[PDB]
Amino acid sequence: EVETFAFQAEIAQLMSLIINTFYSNKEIFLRELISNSSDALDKIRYESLTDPSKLDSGKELHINLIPNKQDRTLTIVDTGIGMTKADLINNLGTIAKSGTKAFMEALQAGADISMIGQFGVGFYSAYLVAEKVTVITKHNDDEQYAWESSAGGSFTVRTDTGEPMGRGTKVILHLKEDQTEYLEERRIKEIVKKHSQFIGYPITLFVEK
Ligand SMILES: CC(C)(C)c1ccc(C(=O)N2CCCC2)s1
Ligand SMILES: CC(C)(C)c1ccc(C(=O)N2CCCC2)s1
């Protein structure tokens, strides 16, 4: 059972701006997604202090970067708090509405796209390099879900029958044909060292066949 939802008008507008604006400094997408993963790991770590049973779904707090040239995907995996169905459909988009409008105002005043994270909508920077984004996520209080959008004003949510995850979030970036540099090991290392050097969780860059 696949449900299709329309983005809020403000978010669809932000997504089209990110897709259509000429902006060469695309590499900042990885810093934003890694920062999102770090925040989610901070969250489950905090909650586990007063309820250690919240780590029964996985004690390890880490971030994995997994490129796949065969599928032309870059996957960012974390074992953070994860997102409920309500997060995916309603809550996160509701927060992102004010941050979007503020970010658009700043862009008209002289700001640039790399400052998107200061407005809390850094996830959407994924569409600088991805034609489609799939988000697999599992929160302790809900089932495993798959969120997906190729932009165009709509996204889908379904119950995920893939491999069980334990807890956390997988962001699968289906890269644009001309953005395959972000599948190369030395390019990913360079970006992580430049923008994510002090993340307080182990970041493992997987290597391919
Ligand atoms: C896909 C969308 C827009 C719902 C997301 C916003 C932030 C996400 C994220 O990386 N995490 C949130 C907590 C788990 C890690 S996913
Ligand atoms: C991405 C953004 C900024 C819209 C978020 C809202 C709530 C987030 C979160 O980490 N939690 C969800 C579980 C409680 C803490 S992240």
Write the CATH number for 148: 3.30.565.10
* 113 within 8 A of 181, measured Cβ to Cβ: no
Query: Annotated binding residue at 78?
Result: yes
Token output for 182: 């972000």
Residue span of the structural domain in which 100 resides: 2-205
Token output for 114: 């790399």
Distance from the CA of 92 to the center of ligand 2, in angstroms? Answer: 7
Token output for 63: 């971030």
Query: Annotated binding residue at 7?
Result: no
Rounded CA gap, 203 and 201, in Å?
6
Distance from the CA of 55 to the center of ligand 1, in angstroms? Answer: 19
Looking at the DSSP bridge assignments, the partners of residue 173 are: 74, 133
Mutate to test the pocket of ligand 2, among 36, 46, 85, 92 (most ligand atoms within 8 A of CB): 92
- Residue 20's φ and ψ, nearest 5 degrees, are -100, -25
Rounded CA gap, 32 and 35, in Å?
5
Task: Report how far apart, in Å, the C-alpha atoms of 87 and of each of 96, 114, 197 are.
Answer: 11, 25, 29
Ligand 2: which atom is nearest the Cα of residue 120? Answer: 3
Sign of CA dihedral 22, 101, 44, 58: negative
Sign of CA dihedral 38, 41, 43, 45: negative
Name the experiment that determined this structure.
Answer: X-ray
Starting from the CA of residue 14, give the closest ligand: 1
Rounded CA gap, 86 and 161, in Å?
19
Rounded CA gap, 68 and 173, in Å?
10
- Please tell me whether residue 111 adopts helix, strand or coil conformation: coil
Resolution (A): 1.8
Q: In one letter, which amino acid is 8?
A: Q
Mutate to test the pocket of ligand 1, among 33, 61, 83 (most ligand atoms within 8 A of CB): 83
- Residue 145's φ and ψ, nearest 5 degrees, are -125, 155
Query: Annotated binding residue at 97?
Result: yes
Token output for 85: 């169905």
Tell me which residue of 19, 22, 3 sits closest to 11, measured CA to CA.
19
- Residue 4's φ and ψ, nearest 5 degrees, are -110, 135
Q: Is 58 exposed, middle or buried (CB count within 10 Å of its CB: 0-12, 13-18, 19+)?
A: middle
Helices (H), 7-145: 9-20, 28-50, 85-86, 92-109
The domain total for the chain is: 1
Mutate to test the pocket of ligand 2, among 10, 33, 37, 43 (most ligand atoms within 8 A of CB): 43
